Each structure stands twice: as C-alpha cells, then as structure tokens.
Design a protein around this ligand. Structure first.
Ligand SMILES: C[n+]1cn([C@@H]2O[C@H](COP(=O)(O)OP(=O)(O)OP(=O)(O)O)[C@@H](O)[C@H]2O)c2nc(N)[nH]c(=O)c21
Length: 184
C-alpha cells in the first residue's frame, strides 16, 4: 500500500466553520450572520484562507468568525451562553499594523489546538472590523473555569507577542448581553 505521507491531507483535530457578518440595518443581527464554508484539514484551511479577503480589507461593520463545527458564533449557543471572550482591542492605526497578523495568528492558535489541555474550552474566535477600532476575541465555553480561561489568556497574549505593558481582559457573554472577569 502507498505511504500515506505522500498523498493524504493533514487532518485537523477539529472541523471548523468560517462565518461572515455584514451589517445591514434592514435585517436582524442573526439574519446578517451567514456560514461561508467548513474545513477539517491543513490544506483546506489554507485554500479557504487564501481566497478570502483580509480582515483589514473588509467594509466597516463586518465580522469573520471561526468556530468549531456545531457551535454557532453567537451568545445564544449552548456552548457559548455560559462562556466569555478574551478581547484584543485595537486602535485605528493597528488596522494597518496588527489586525491581519493578529487574526491569522488567532486562526492558527485555534486549528493548531495551541492551548494544551484547555483547547477543549475554546469555542472559536471573532474579528470585528469597525471604524471606531477593530476587535479580535477568542470565545471560551465556561467563564467560571478559572484555570482554563487564565491559561488560554496567557498563552494567547504570548502568541500574539503583546508586551507586559499591555493588559487584556476576559468578559463573560452574559455581562456583554445584559467588566472583566480576568486579566493577564
Ligand atoms: C456577538 N453578538 C452581537 N450581537 C448584536 O450586535 C451588537 C453589536 O455587538 P458587536 O459584537 O458587533 O460589537 P460592536 O463593536 O459592533 O458594538 P459594541 O461593542 O456594543 O459597541 C450587539 O450589541 C448585539 O445587539 C448579538 N446578538 C445576539 N442575539 N447574539 C450575539 O451573539 C450577538
């Protein structure tokens, strides 16, 4: 039989779904959220990533979301309702300098399962392109899991290369939908 190394795609640990949001005042927030496609290999990730717009080129008001297959990118999902997000807030000058590199690094932290035992607490990630300042966030499934949330935040901050002068926060979705629970 042939050596699999020669011809098989490299499976990822999870199957992931990419979503797109375009702000339209004619429609509800949920109706503006649409599924693009799914992938579960390294090769299919790069084929998707290489044919879509960089976040910095999106019209203001748009989002990308990458979530594990089966989890919708909204607070109301069962695996998001009790969770929260590690938030990266960027200034207007950082759309040029950091937004796209931070986003791709965030994508790799997800599909590469970069958070060791706590990668099962990850639900997905969201980049919001906005005129007042863009945002990148990793969503985790239980805001009360102190060890999981902390270790995800610290690993995330280092992978992004942020210096200790910067401090990022973690907010539960219930607070957003109605403060930081943690900071690293
Ligand atoms: C992520 N999310 C966003 N929305 C709606 O989209 C709105 C904007 O939320 P946003 O996440 O787009 O942040 P933005 O920076 O645009 O707005 P801000 O941070 O309030 O200044 C939210 O206030 C909700 O009305 C959401 N509405 C529901 N029902 N579920 C969601 O998960 C959800």
């Amino acid at each position: 039989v042939a050596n699999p190394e020669h011809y098989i795609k490299h499976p990822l640990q999870n199957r992931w779904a990419l979503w797109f949001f375009k702000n339209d005042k004619s429609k509800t927030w949920q109706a503006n959220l649409r599924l693009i496609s799914k992938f579960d290999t390294v090769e299919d990730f790069w084929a998707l990533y290489n044919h879509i717009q960089l976040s910095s080129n999106l019209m203001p008001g748009c989002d990308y979301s990458l979530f594990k297959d089966g989890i919708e990118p909204m607070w109301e999902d069962e695996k998001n309702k009790r969770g929260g997000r590690w938030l990266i807030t960027l200034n207007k000058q950082q759309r040029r300098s950091d937004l796209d590199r931070f986003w791709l690094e965030t994508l790799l932290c997800l599909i590469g399962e970069s958070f060791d035992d706590y990668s099962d607490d990850v639900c997905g990630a969201v980049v919001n392109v906005r005129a007042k300042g863009d945002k990148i966030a990793i969503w985790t499934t239980e805001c009360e899991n102190r060890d999981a949330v902390t270790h995800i935040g610290r690993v995330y901050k280092e992978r992004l290369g942020l210096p200790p002068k910067i401090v990022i926060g973690y907010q539960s979705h219930a607070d957003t939908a109605t403060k930081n629970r943690f900071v690293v």
